[PDB]
């Protein structure tokens, strides 16, 4: 897997 | 003092159960310090991921207030579009009334389909909130529902129970020594300066400082592709047949700590934390990803780091507190 906001 | 127990899924994802509406409909949400929106799936959503996760039904809540505004959020992994609505959210024994959240319309792709959580509850600053929607912790503080304008996270290791987010308090039971406090550099993510990254007294990356975010919603240690390729060579990791960056399991015994120096304090990450045990083999806990900002290219201090260090996120003073887990 998880890579959470741009 | 108000605690939310979190379920640890395979050391990769940490999520808890919230209640939205009157009466409460229950959802599982990642408590994410790397985003600021709250959203859950709704009945308006017909994407594959919406069909196998809980769906908010606004018709069934006596306290639901609609808006005519929409939200779109892109994550490193996953994305959604929705409509913004207001309801009561029950989080960590707090009844957070008049909370703006997103009800999903589309959740495209396979990532959100296979994920065990329904939505995301973002715990970062309002300045990165899509459609300027008030984050949960901001709305809790503004309503005077806590006394201390901070929360703290303990993430468990080895699939164990015990992970917690503590809203409006610290529990000194979780850490050893005293908290070291690090100023937030840019108020968006929980962003800090990392003075250097060393191994055996040599800088392997970020020799003259770099910008990092502390992110409960990122599984691994993330940085720009070029310094990460250097770190992979240093820990003896090679790209396997299926794209995975593998290292020999025997080698954990002979690798040195990688040290993150933050505000002149050393934070070692041992090889038993930065090499992960996965599907029978050992993989690197370092991942290559470029996130460019106004303040350079970001590193992410993901779950690999937070498991080692109890983390306090202080909104009153715009500081992060770190101490070794007990």
PDB file of N, CA and C in Angstrom, chain B residues 148-216:
ATOM      1  N   UNK B 148      -6.438  17.343  24.096  1.00  0.00           N
ATOM      2  CA  UNK B 148      -5.098  17.457  23.481  1.00  0.00           C
ATOM      3  C   UNK B 148      -5.213  17.275  21.957  1.00  0.00           C
ATOM      4  N   UNK B 149      -4.689  18.262  21.249  1.00  0.00           N
ATOM      5  CA  UNK B 149      -4.754  18.344  19.768  1.00  0.00           C
ATOM      6  C   UNK B 149      -3.649  17.487  19.143  1.00  0.00           C
ATOM      7  N   UNK B 150      -3.683  16.223  19.513  1.00  0.00           N
ATOM      8  CA  UNK B 150      -2.730  15.223  19.033  1.00  0.00           C
ATOM      9  C   UNK B 150      -3.384  13.847  19.045  1.00  0.00           C
ATOM     10  N   UNK B 151      -2.759  12.989  18.263  1.00  0.00           N
ATOM     11  CA  UNK B 151      -3.032  11.566  18.296  1.00  0.00           C
ATOM     12  C   UNK B 151      -1.721  10.768  18.213  1.00  0.00           C
ATOM     13  N   UNK B 152      -1.766   9.523  18.618  1.00  0.00           N
ATOM     14  CA  UNK B 152      -0.557   8.711  18.616  1.00  0.00           C
ATOM     15  C   UNK B 152      -0.840   7.293  18.151  1.00  0.00           C
ATOM     16  N   UNK B 153       0.170   6.723  17.502  1.00  0.00           N
ATOM     17  CA  UNK B 153       0.021   5.436  16.816  1.00  0.00           C
ATOM     18  C   UNK B 153       1.085   4.483  17.349  1.00  0.00           C
ATOM     19  N   UNK B 154       0.579   3.293  17.619  1.00  0.00           N
ATOM     20  CA  UNK B 154       1.406   2.096  17.862  1.00  0.00           C
ATOM     21  C   UNK B 154       0.988   1.036  16.846  1.00  0.00           C
ATOM     22  N   UNK B 155       1.920   0.588  16.023  1.00  0.00           N
ATOM     23  CA  UNK B 155       1.664  -0.463  15.043  1.00  0.00           C
ATOM     24  C   UNK B 155       2.427  -1.717  15.495  1.00  0.00           C
ATOM     25  N   UNK B 156       1.695  -2.801  15.644  1.00  0.00           N
ATOM     26  CA  UNK B 156       2.248  -4.099  16.064  1.00  0.00           C
ATOM     27  C   UNK B 156       3.061  -4.765  14.959  1.00  0.00           C
ATOM     28  N   UNK B 157       3.883  -5.719  15.343  1.00  0.00           N
ATOM     29  CA  UNK B 157       4.704  -6.508  14.397  1.00  0.00           C
ATOM     30  C   UNK B 157       4.175  -7.946  14.349  1.00  0.00           C
ATOM     31  N   UNK B 158       4.660  -8.702  13.361  1.00  0.00           N
ATOM     32  CA  UNK B 158       4.396 -10.165  13.222  1.00  0.00           C
ATOM     33  C   UNK B 158       2.909 -10.587  13.301  1.00  0.00           C
ATOM     34  N   UNK B 159       2.031  -9.866  12.601  1.00  0.00           N
ATOM     35  CA  UNK B 159       0.572 -10.125  12.599  1.00  0.00           C
ATOM     36  C   UNK B 159      -0.155 -10.123  13.960  1.00  0.00           C
ATOM     37  N   UNK B 160       0.482  -9.544  14.970  1.00  0.00           N
ATOM     38  CA  UNK B 160      -0.084  -9.531  16.330  1.00  0.00           C
ATOM     39  C   UNK B 160      -1.212  -8.492  16.544  1.00  0.00           C
ATOM     40  N   UNK B 161      -2.124  -8.781  17.485  1.00  0.00           N
ATOM     41  CA  UNK B 161      -3.064  -7.777  18.017  1.00  0.00           C
ATOM     42  C   UNK B 161      -2.272  -6.693  18.762  1.00  0.00           C
ATOM     43  N   UNK B 162      -2.940  -5.579  19.010  1.00  0.00           N
ATOM     44  CA  UNK B 162      -2.415  -4.543  19.886  1.00  0.00           C
ATOM     45  C   UNK B 162      -2.233  -3.214  19.200  1.00  0.00           C
ATOM     46  N   UNK B 163      -2.180  -3.156  17.854  1.00  0.00           N
ATOM     47  CA  UNK B 163      -2.033  -1.836  17.204  1.00  0.00           C
ATOM     48  C   UNK B 163      -3.189  -0.930  17.651  1.00  0.00           C
ATOM     49  N   UNK B 164      -2.889   0.342  17.860  1.00  0.00           N
ATOM     50  CA  UNK B 164      -3.855   1.353  18.338  1.00  0.00           C
ATOM     51  C   UNK B 164      -3.524   2.709  17.737  1.00  0.00           C
ATOM     52  N   UNK B 165      -4.589   3.461  17.480  1.00  0.00           N
ATOM     53  CA  UNK B 165      -4.481   4.931  17.349  1.00  0.00           C
ATOM     54  C   UNK B 165      -5.093   5.480  18.627  1.00  0.00           C
ATOM     55  N   UNK B 166      -4.399   6.402  19.268  1.00  0.00           N
ATOM     56  CA  UNK B 166      -4.918   7.044  20.496  1.00  0.00           C
ATOM     57  C   UNK B 166      -5.242   8.493  20.123  1.00  0.00           C
ATOM     58  N   UNK B 167      -6.511   8.835  20.156  1.00  0.00           N
ATOM     59  CA  UNK B 167      -6.968  10.222  19.879  1.00  0.00           C
ATOM     60  C   UNK B 167      -6.993  11.032  21.179  1.00  0.00           C
ATOM     61  N   UNK B 168      -6.309  12.157  21.095  1.00  0.00           N
ATOM     62  CA  UNK B 168      -6.167  13.134  22.182  1.00  0.00           C
ATOM     63  C   UNK B 168      -5.327  12.686  23.370  1.00  0.00           C
ATOM     64  N   UNK B 169      -4.340  11.826  23.147  1.00  0.00           N
ATOM     65  CA  UNK B 169      -3.487  11.373  24.251  1.00  0.00           C
ATOM     66  C   UNK B 169      -2.357  10.459  23.821  1.00  0.00           C
ATOM     67  N   UNK B 170      -1.454  10.344  24.771  1.00  0.00           N
ATOM     68  CA  UNK B 170      -0.258   9.489  24.685  1.00  0.00           C
ATOM     69  C   UNK B 170      -0.450   8.388  25.733  1.00  0.00           C
ATOM     70  N   UNK B 171       0.097   7.232  25.441  1.00  0.00           N
ATOM     71  CA  UNK B 171       0.220   6.195  26.475  1.00  0.00           C
ATOM     72  C   UNK B 171       1.698   5.770  26.553  1.00  0.00           C
ATOM     73  N   UNK B 172       2.365   6.210  27.619  1.00  0.00           N
ATOM     74  CA  UNK B 172       3.802   5.940  27.849  1.00  0.00           C
ATOM     75  C   UNK B 172       4.167   4.478  28.056  1.00  0.00           C
ATOM     76  N   UNK B 173       3.166   3.634  28.271  1.00  0.00           N
ATOM     77  CA  UNK B 173       3.266   2.157  28.280  1.00  0.00           C
ATOM     78  C   UNK B 173       3.903   1.585  27.004  1.00  0.00           C
ATOM     79  N   UNK B 174       3.713   2.273  25.877  1.00  0.00           N
ATOM     80  CA  UNK B 174       4.081   1.799  24.523  1.00  0.00           C
ATOM     81  C   UNK B 174       5.530   2.029  24.083  1.00  0.00           C
ATOM     82  N   UNK B 175       6.220   2.927  24.773  1.00  0.00           N
ATOM     83  CA  UNK B 175       7.587   3.343  24.407  1.00  0.00           C
ATOM     84  C   UNK B 175       8.572   3.364  25.578  1.00  0.00           C
ATOM     85  N   UNK B 176       9.851   3.375  25.249  1.00  0.00           N
ATOM     86  CA  UNK B 176      10.935   3.437  26.246  1.00  0.00           C
ATOM     87  C   UNK B 176      11.723   4.725  26.102  1.00  0.00           C
ATOM     88  N   UNK B 177      12.023   5.294  27.261  1.00  0.00           N
ATOM     89  CA  UNK B 177      12.726   6.585  27.361  1.00  0.00           C
ATOM     90  C   UNK B 177      11.714   7.726  27.226  1.00  0.00           C
ATOM     91  N   UNK B 178      12.216   8.834  26.700  1.00  0.00           N
ATOM     92  CA  UNK B 178      11.409  10.040  26.432  1.00  0.00           C
ATOM     93  C   UNK B 178      11.280  10.264  24.919  1.00  0.00           C
ATOM     94  N   UNK B 179      10.161  10.887  24.582  1.00  0.00           N
ATOM     95  CA  UNK B 179       9.819  11.317  23.214  1.00  0.00           C
ATOM     96  C   UNK B 179      10.816  12.380  22.765  1.00  0.00           C
ATOM     97  N   UNK B 180      11.344  12.137  21.580  1.00  0.00           N
ATOM     98  CA  UNK B 180      12.086  13.181  20.827  1.00  0.00           C
ATOM     99  C   UNK B 180      11.092  13.815  19.837  1.00  0.00           C
ATOM    100  N   UNK B 181      11.120  15.127  19.799  1.00  0.00           N
ATOM    101  CA  UNK B 181      10.199  15.960  19.011  1.00  0.00           C
ATOM    102  C   UNK B 181      10.895  16.538  17.774  1.00  0.00           C
ATOM    103  N   UNK B 182      10.250  16.384  16.627  1.00  0.00           N
ATOM    104  CA  UNK B 182      10.782  16.797  15.295  1.00  0.00           C
ATOM    105  C   UNK B 182       9.791  17.828  14.685  1.00  0.00           C
ATOM    106  N   UNK B 183      10.235  19.051  14.341  1.00  0.00           N
ATOM    107  CA  UNK B 183       9.352  20.031  13.697  1.00  0.00           C
ATOM    108  C   UNK B 183       8.887  19.568  12.313  1.00  0.00           C
ATOM    109  N   UNK B 184       7.599  19.744  12.025  1.00  0.00           N
ATOM    110  CA  UNK B 184       7.068  19.571  10.659  1.00  0.00           C
ATOM    111  C   UNK B 184       7.588  20.767   9.839  1.00  0.00           C
ATOM    112  N   UNK B 185       8.155  20.417   8.685  1.00  0.00           N
ATOM    113  CA  UNK B 185       8.752  21.390   7.752  1.00  0.00           C
ATOM    114  C   UNK B 185       7.694  22.007   6.829  1.00  0.00           C
ATOM    115  N   UNK B 186       6.852  21.158   6.266  1.00  0.00           N
ATOM    116  CA  UNK B 186       5.744  21.645   5.407  1.00  0.00           C
ATOM    117  C   UNK B 186       4.470  20.984   5.928  1.00  0.00           C
ATOM    118  N   UNK B 187       3.443  21.809   6.149  1.00  0.00           N
ATOM    119  CA  UNK B 187       2.162  21.378   6.724  1.00  0.00           C
ATOM    120  C   UNK B 187       1.170  20.949   5.617  1.00  0.00           C
ATOM    121  N   UNK B 188       1.242  19.661   5.292  1.00  0.00           N
ATOM    122  CA  UNK B 188       0.430  18.952   4.275  1.00  0.00           C
ATOM    123  C   UNK B 188       0.326  17.475   4.636  1.00  0.00           C
ATOM    124  N   UNK B 189       1.372  16.760   4.259  1.00  0.00           N
ATOM    125  CA  UNK B 189       1.675  15.449   4.865  1.00  0.00           C
ATOM    126  C   UNK B 189       2.292  15.720   6.272  1.00  0.00           C
ATOM    127  N   UNK B 190       2.559  14.693   7.059  1.00  0.00           N
ATOM    128  CA  UNK B 190       3.428  14.889   8.240  1.00  0.00           C
ATOM    129  C   UNK B 190       4.889  14.806   7.780  1.00  0.00           C
ATOM    130  N   UNK B 191       5.366  15.943   7.301  1.00  0.00           N
ATOM    131  CA  UNK B 191       6.666  16.056   6.628  1.00  0.00           C
ATOM    132  C   UNK B 191       7.761  16.606   7.558  1.00  0.00           C
ATOM    133  N   UNK B 192       8.901  15.924   7.551  1.00  0.00           N
ATOM    134  CA  UNK B 192      10.066  16.207   8.415  1.00  0.00           C
ATOM    135  C   UNK B 192      11.349  16.184   7.560  1.00  0.00           C
ATOM    136  N   UNK B 193      12.458  16.668   8.100  1.00  0.00           N
ATOM    137  CA  UNK B 193      13.778  16.544   7.462  1.00  0.00           C
ATOM    138  C   UNK B 193      14.433  15.294   8.039  1.00  0.00           C
ATOM    139  N   UNK B 194      15.014  14.487   7.174  1.00  0.00           N
ATOM    140  CA  UNK B 194      15.900  13.383   7.576  1.00  0.00           C
ATOM    141  C   UNK B 194      17.318  13.899   7.288  1.00  0.00           C
ATOM    142  N   UNK B 195      18.120  13.970   8.337  1.00  0.00           N
ATOM    143  CA  UNK B 195      19.462  14.574   8.227  1.00  0.00           C
ATOM    144  C   UNK B 195      20.384  13.748   7.341  1.00  0.00           C
ATOM    145  N   UNK B 196      20.254  12.422   7.461  1.00  0.00           N
ATOM    146  CA  UNK B 196      21.039  11.486   6.654  1.00  0.00           C
ATOM    147  C   UNK B 196      20.564  10.052   6.888  1.00  0.00           C
ATOM    148  N   UNK B 197      20.904   9.202   5.914  1.00  0.00           N
ATOM    149  CA  UNK B 197      20.708   7.756   5.987  1.00  0.00           C
ATOM    150  C   UNK B 197      22.089   7.069   5.921  1.00  0.00           C
ATOM    151  N   UNK B 198      22.463   6.412   7.011  1.00  0.00           N
ATOM    152  CA  UNK B 198      23.791   5.763   7.074  1.00  0.00           C
ATOM    153  C   UNK B 198      23.760   4.255   7.317  1.00  0.00           C
ATOM    154  N   UNK B 199      24.862   3.615   6.924  1.00  0.00           N
ATOM    155  CA  UNK B 199      25.184   2.194   7.205  1.00  0.00           C
ATOM    156  C   UNK B 199      26.697   2.063   7.477  1.00  0.00           C
ATOM    157  N   UNK B 200      27.092   1.540   8.634  1.00  0.00           N
ATOM    158  CA  UNK B 200      28.533   1.412   8.994  1.00  0.00           C
ATOM    159  C   UNK B 200      29.324   2.753   8.954  1.00  0.00           C
ATOM    160  N   UNK B 201      28.664   3.798   9.444  1.00  0.00           N
ATOM    161  CA  UNK B 201      29.183   5.177   9.466  1.00  0.00           C
ATOM    162  C   UNK B 201      29.373   5.876   8.111  1.00  0.00           C
ATOM    163  N   UNK B 202      28.880   5.296   7.012  1.00  0.00           N
ATOM    164  CA  UNK B 202      28.856   5.928   5.673  1.00  0.00           C
ATOM    165  C   UNK B 202      27.409   6.247   5.199  1.00  0.00           C
ATOM    166  N   UNK B 203      27.175   7.487   4.767  1.00  0.00           N
ATOM    167  CA  UNK B 203      25.929   7.908   4.082  1.00  0.00           C
ATOM    168  C   UNK B 203      25.718   7.116   2.777  1.00  0.00           C
ATOM    169  N   UNK B 204      24.650   6.325   2.789  1.00  0.00           N
ATOM    170  CA  UNK B 204      24.201   5.543   1.615  1.00  0.00           C
ATOM    171  C   UNK B 204      23.165   6.285   0.745  1.00  0.00           C
ATOM    172  N   UNK B 205      22.502   7.272   1.340  1.00  0.00           N
ATOM    173  CA  UNK B 205      21.547   8.171   0.671  1.00  0.00           C
ATOM    174  C   UNK B 205      21.371   9.423   1.543  1.00  0.00           C
ATOM    175  N   UNK B 206      20.917  10.520   0.936  1.00  0.00           N
ATOM    176  CA  UNK B 206      20.455  11.704   1.690  1.00  0.00           C
ATOM    177  C   UNK B 206      21.578  12.263   2.589  1.00  0.00           C
ATOM    178  N   UNK B 207      22.800  12.243   2.061  1.00  0.00           N
ATOM    179  CA  UNK B 207      24.045  12.726   2.691  1.00  0.00           C
ATOM    180  C   UNK B 207      24.021  14.142   3.259  1.00  0.00           C
ATOM    181  N   UNK B 208      23.221  15.010   2.638  1.00  0.00           N
ATOM    182  CA  UNK B 208      23.045  16.402   3.100  1.00  0.00           C
ATOM    183  C   UNK B 208      21.583  16.721   3.364  1.00  0.00           C
ATOM    184  N   UNK B 209      20.881  15.736   3.926  1.00  0.00           N
ATOM    185  CA  UNK B 209      19.464  15.915   4.234  1.00  0.00           C
ATOM    186  C   UNK B 209      18.531  15.749   3.028  1.00  0.00           C
ATOM    187  N   UNK B 210      17.332  15.311   3.408  1.00  0.00           N
ATOM    188  CA  UNK B 210      16.207  15.047   2.494  1.00  0.00           C
ATOM    189  C   UNK B 210      14.877  15.194   3.254  1.00  0.00           C
ATOM    190  N   UNK B 211      13.786  15.338   2.503  1.00  0.00           N
ATOM    191  CA  UNK B 211      12.417  15.474   3.054  1.00  0.00           C
ATOM    192  C   UNK B 211      11.701  14.128   3.028  1.00  0.00           C
ATOM    193  N   UNK B 212      11.106  13.816   4.173  1.00  0.00           N
ATOM    194  CA  UNK B 212      10.421  12.533   4.357  1.00  0.00           C
ATOM    195  C   UNK B 212       9.041  12.796   4.984  1.00  0.00           C
ATOM    196  N   UNK B 213       8.105  11.910   4.691  1.00  0.00           N
ATOM    197  CA  UNK B 213       6.780  11.963   5.346  1.00  0.00           C
ATOM    198  C   UNK B 213       6.631  10.735   6.258  1.00  0.00           C
ATOM    199  N   UNK B 214       5.886  10.900   7.337  1.00  0.00           N
ATOM    200  CA  UNK B 214       5.640   9.755   8.243  1.00  0.00           C
ATOM    201  C   UNK B 214       4.229   9.272   7.916  1.00  0.00           C
ATOM    202  N   UNK B 215       4.169   8.066   7.364  1.00  0.00           N
ATOM    203  CA  UNK B 215       2.929   7.585   6.707  1.00  0.00           C
ATOM    204  C   UNK B 215       2.550   6.188   7.125  1.00  0.00           C
ATOM    205  N   UNK B 216       1.547   6.156   7.998  1.00  0.00           N
ATOM    206  CA  UNK B 216       0.985   4.868   8.476  1.00  0.00           C
ATOM    207  C   UNK B 216       0.341   4.076   7.340  1.00  0.00           C
TER     208      UNK B 216
END
